[PDB]
CSV table of N, CA and C in Angstrom, one decimal:
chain,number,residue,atom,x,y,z
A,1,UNK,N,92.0,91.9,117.3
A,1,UNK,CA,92.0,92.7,116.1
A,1,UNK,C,93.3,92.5,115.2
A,2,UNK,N,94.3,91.9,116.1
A,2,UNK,CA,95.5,92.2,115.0
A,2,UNK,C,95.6,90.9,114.0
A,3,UNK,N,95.2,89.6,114.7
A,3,UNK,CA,94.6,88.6,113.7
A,3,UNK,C,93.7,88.8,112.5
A,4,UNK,N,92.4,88.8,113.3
A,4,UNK,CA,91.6,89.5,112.5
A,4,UNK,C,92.0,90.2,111.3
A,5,UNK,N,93.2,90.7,111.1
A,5,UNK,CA,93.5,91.5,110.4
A,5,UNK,C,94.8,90.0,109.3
A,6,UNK,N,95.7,90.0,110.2
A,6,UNK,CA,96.4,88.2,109.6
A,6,UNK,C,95.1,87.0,108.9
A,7,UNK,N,94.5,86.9,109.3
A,7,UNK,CA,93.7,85.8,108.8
A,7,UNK,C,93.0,86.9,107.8
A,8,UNK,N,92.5,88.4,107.5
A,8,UNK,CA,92.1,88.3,106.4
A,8,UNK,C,92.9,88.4,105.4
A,9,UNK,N,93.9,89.1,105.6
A,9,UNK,CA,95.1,89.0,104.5
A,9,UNK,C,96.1,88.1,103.8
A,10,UNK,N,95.4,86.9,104.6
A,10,UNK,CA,96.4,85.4,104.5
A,10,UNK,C,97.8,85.6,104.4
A,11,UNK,N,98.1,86.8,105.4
A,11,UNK,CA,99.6,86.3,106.3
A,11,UNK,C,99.6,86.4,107.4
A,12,UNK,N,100.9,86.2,108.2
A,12,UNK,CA,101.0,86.3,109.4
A,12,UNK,C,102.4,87.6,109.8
A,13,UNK,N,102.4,88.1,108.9
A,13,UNK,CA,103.1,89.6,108.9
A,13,UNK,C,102.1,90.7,108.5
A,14,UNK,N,101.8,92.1,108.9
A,14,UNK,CA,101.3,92.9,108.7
A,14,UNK,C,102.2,94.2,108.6
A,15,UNK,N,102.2,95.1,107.7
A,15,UNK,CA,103.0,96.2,107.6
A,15,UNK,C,102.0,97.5,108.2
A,16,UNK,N,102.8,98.4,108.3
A,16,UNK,CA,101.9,99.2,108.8
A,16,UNK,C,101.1,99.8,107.9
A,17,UNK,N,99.7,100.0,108.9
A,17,UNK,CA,98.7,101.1,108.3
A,17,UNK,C,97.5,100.8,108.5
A,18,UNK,N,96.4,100.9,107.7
A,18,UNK,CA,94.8,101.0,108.3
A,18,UNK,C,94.3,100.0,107.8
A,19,UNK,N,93.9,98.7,108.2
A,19,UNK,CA,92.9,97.6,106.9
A,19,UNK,C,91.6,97.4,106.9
A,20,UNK,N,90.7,97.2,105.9
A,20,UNK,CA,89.7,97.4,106.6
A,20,UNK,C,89.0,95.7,106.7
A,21,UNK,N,88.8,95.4,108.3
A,21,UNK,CA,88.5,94.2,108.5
A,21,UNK,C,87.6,93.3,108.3
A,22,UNK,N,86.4,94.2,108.9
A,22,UNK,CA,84.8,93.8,109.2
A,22,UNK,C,84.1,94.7,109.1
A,23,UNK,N,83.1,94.5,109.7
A,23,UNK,CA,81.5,95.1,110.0
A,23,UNK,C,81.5,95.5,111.4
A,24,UNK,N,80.6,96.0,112.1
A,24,UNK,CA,80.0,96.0,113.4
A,24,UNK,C,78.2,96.1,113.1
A,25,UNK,N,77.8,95.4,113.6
A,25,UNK,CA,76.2,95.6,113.4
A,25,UNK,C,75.8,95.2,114.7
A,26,UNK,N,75.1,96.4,115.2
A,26,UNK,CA,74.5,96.2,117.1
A,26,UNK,C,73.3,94.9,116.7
A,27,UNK,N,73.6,94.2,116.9
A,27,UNK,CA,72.7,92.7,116.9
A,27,UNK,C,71.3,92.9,117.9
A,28,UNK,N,69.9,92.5,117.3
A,28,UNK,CA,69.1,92.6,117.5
A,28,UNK,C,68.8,92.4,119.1
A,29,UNK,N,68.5,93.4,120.4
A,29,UNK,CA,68.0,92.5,121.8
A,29,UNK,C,66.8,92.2,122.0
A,30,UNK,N,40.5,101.6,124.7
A,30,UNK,CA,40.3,100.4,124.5
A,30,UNK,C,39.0,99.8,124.7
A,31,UNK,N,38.3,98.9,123.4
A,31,UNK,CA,37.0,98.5,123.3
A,31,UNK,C,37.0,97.3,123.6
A,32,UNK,N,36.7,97.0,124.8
A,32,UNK,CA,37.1,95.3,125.6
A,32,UNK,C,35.9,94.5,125.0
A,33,UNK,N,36.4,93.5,124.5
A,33,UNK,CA,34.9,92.4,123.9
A,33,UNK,C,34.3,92.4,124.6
A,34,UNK,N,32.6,92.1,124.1
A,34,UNK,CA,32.0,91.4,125.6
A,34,UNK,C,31.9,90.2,125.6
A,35,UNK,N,33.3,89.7,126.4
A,35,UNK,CA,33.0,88.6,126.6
A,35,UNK,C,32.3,88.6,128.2
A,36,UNK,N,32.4,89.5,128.8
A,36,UNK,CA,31.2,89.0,130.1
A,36,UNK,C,29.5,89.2,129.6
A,37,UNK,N,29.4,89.9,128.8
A,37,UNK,CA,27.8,89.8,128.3
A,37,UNK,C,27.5,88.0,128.3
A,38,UNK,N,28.2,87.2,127.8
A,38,UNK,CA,28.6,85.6,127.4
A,38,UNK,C,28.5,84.9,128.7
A,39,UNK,N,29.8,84.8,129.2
A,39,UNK,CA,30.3,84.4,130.6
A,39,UNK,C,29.3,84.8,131.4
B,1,UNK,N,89.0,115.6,92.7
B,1,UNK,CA,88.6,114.4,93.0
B,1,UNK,C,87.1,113.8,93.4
B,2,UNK,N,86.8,112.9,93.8
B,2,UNK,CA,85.1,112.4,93.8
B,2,UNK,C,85.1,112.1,94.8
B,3,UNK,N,84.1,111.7,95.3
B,3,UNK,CA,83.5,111.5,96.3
B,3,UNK,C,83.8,109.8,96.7
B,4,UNK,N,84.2,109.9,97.8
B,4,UNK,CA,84.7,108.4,98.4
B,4,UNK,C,83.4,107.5,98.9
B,5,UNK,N,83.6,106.4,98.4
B,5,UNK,CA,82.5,105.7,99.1
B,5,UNK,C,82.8,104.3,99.7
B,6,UNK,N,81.8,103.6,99.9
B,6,UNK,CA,82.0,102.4,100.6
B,6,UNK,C,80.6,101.3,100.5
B,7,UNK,N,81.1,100.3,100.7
B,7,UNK,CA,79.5,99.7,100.3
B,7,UNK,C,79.6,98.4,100.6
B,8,UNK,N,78.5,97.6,101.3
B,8,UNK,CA,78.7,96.8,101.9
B,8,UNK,C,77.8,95.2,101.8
B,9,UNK,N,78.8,94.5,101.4
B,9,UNK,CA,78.1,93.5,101.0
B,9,UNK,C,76.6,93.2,101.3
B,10,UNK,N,76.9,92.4,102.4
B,10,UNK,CA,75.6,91.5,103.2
B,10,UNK,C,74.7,92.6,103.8
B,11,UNK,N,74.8,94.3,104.0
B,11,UNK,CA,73.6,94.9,103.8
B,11,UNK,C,72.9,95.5,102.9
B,12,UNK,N,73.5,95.4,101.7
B,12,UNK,CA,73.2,96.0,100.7
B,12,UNK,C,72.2,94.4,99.9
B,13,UNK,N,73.2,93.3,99.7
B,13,UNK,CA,72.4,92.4,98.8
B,13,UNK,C,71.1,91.3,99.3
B,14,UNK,N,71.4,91.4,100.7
B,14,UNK,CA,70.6,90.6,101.7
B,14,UNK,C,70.3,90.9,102.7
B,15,UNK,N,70.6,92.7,103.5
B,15,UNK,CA,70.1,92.9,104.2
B,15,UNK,C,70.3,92.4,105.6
B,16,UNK,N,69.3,92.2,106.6
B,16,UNK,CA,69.6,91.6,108.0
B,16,UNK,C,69.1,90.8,107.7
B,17,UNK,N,68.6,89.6,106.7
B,17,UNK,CA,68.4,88.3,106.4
B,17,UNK,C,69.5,87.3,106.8
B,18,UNK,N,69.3,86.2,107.8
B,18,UNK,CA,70.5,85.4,108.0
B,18,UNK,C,70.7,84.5,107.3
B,19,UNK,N,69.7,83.7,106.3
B,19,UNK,CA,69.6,82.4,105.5
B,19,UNK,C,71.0,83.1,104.4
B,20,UNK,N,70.2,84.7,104.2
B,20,UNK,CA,70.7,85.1,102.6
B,20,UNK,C,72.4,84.9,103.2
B,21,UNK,N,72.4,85.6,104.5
B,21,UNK,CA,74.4,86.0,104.1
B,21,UNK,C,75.1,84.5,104.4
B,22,UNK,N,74.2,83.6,105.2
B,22,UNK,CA,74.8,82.1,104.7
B,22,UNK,C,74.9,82.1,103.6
B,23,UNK,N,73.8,81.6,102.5
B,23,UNK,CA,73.9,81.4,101.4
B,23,UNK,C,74.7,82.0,100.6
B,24,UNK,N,75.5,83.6,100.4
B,24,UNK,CA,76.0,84.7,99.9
B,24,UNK,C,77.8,83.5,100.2
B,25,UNK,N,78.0,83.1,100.8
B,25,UNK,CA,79.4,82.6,101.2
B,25,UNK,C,79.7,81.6,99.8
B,26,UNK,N,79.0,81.1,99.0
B,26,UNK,CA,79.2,80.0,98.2
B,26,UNK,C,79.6,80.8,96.8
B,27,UNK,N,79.5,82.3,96.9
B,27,UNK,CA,79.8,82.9,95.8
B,27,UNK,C,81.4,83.2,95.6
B,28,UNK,N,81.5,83.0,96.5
B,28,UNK,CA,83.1,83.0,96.7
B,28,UNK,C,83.9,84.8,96.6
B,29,UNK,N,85.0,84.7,96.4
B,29,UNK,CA,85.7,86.2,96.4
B,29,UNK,C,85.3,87.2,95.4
B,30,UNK,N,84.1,87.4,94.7
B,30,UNK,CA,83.7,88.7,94.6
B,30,UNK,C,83.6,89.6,95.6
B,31,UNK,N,82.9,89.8,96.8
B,31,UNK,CA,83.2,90.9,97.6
B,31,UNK,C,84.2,91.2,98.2
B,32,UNK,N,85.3,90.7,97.9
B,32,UNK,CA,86.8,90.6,98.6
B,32,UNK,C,87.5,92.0,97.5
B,33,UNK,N,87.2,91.5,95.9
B,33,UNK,CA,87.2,92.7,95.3
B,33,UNK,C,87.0,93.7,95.0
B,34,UNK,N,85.6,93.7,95.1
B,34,UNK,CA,84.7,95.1,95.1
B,34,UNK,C,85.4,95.8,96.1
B,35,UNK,N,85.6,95.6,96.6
B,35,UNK,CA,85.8,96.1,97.9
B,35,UNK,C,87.6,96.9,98.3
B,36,UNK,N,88.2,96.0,97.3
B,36,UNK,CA,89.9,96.1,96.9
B,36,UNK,C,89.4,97.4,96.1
B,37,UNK,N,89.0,97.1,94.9
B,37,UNK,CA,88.6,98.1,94.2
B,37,UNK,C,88.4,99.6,94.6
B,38,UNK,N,86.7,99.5,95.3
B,38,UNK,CA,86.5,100.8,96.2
B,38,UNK,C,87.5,101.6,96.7
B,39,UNK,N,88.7,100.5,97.9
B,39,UNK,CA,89.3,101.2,98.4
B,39,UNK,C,90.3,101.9,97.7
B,40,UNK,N,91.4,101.4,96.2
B,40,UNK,CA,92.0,101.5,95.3
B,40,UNK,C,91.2,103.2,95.0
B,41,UNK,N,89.8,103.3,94.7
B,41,UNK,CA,89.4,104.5,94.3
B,41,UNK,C,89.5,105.6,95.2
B,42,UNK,N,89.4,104.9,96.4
B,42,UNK,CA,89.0,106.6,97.8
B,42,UNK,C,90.6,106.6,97.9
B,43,UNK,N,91.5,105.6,98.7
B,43,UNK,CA,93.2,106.4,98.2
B,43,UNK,C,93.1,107.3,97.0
B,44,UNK,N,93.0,106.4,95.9
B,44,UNK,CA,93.6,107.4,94.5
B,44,UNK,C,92.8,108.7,94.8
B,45,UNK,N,91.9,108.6,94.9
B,45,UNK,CA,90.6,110.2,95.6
B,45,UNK,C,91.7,111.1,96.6
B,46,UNK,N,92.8,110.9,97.3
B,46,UNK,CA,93.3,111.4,98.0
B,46,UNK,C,94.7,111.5,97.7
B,47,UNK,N,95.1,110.8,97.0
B,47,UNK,CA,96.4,111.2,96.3
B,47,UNK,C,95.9,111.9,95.2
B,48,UNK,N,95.0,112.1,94.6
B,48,UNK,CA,95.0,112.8,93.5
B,48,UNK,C,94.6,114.6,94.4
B,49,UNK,N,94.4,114.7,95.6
B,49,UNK,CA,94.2,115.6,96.3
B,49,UNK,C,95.7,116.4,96.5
């Protein structure tokens, strides 16, 4: 997270406080025919 | 002060569509701003508190 946070800001120093990075999105996981009348 | 909000790209313009938020990357840094912006408003929403 603390990259995450450098690569959005295009540095590699961060000062302090809250950034906002990303997203989080929870990622995706009776009338019988007659068929024996036939058969 | 107003009411703070937030708003979010790739659910808002495309949804859980995966072609769209590929395709959404070629538009380059508009939602990098909106989003500067937004935040720029809910601070000032709280300094002006």
């Amino acid at each position: 997270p603390l990259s995450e946070t450098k690569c959005t800001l295009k540095s590699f120093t961060v000062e302090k406080g809250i950034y906002q990075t990303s997203n989080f999105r929870v990622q995706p996981t009776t009338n019988l025919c007659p068929f024996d009348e036939v058969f | 002060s107003m009411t703070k909000t937030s708003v979010d790209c790739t659910m808002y313009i495309c949804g859980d569509s995966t072609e769209c938020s590929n395709l959404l990357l070629q538009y380059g840094s508009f939602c990098t701003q909106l989003k500067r912006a937004l935040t720029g408003i809910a601070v000032e929403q709280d300094k002006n508190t």
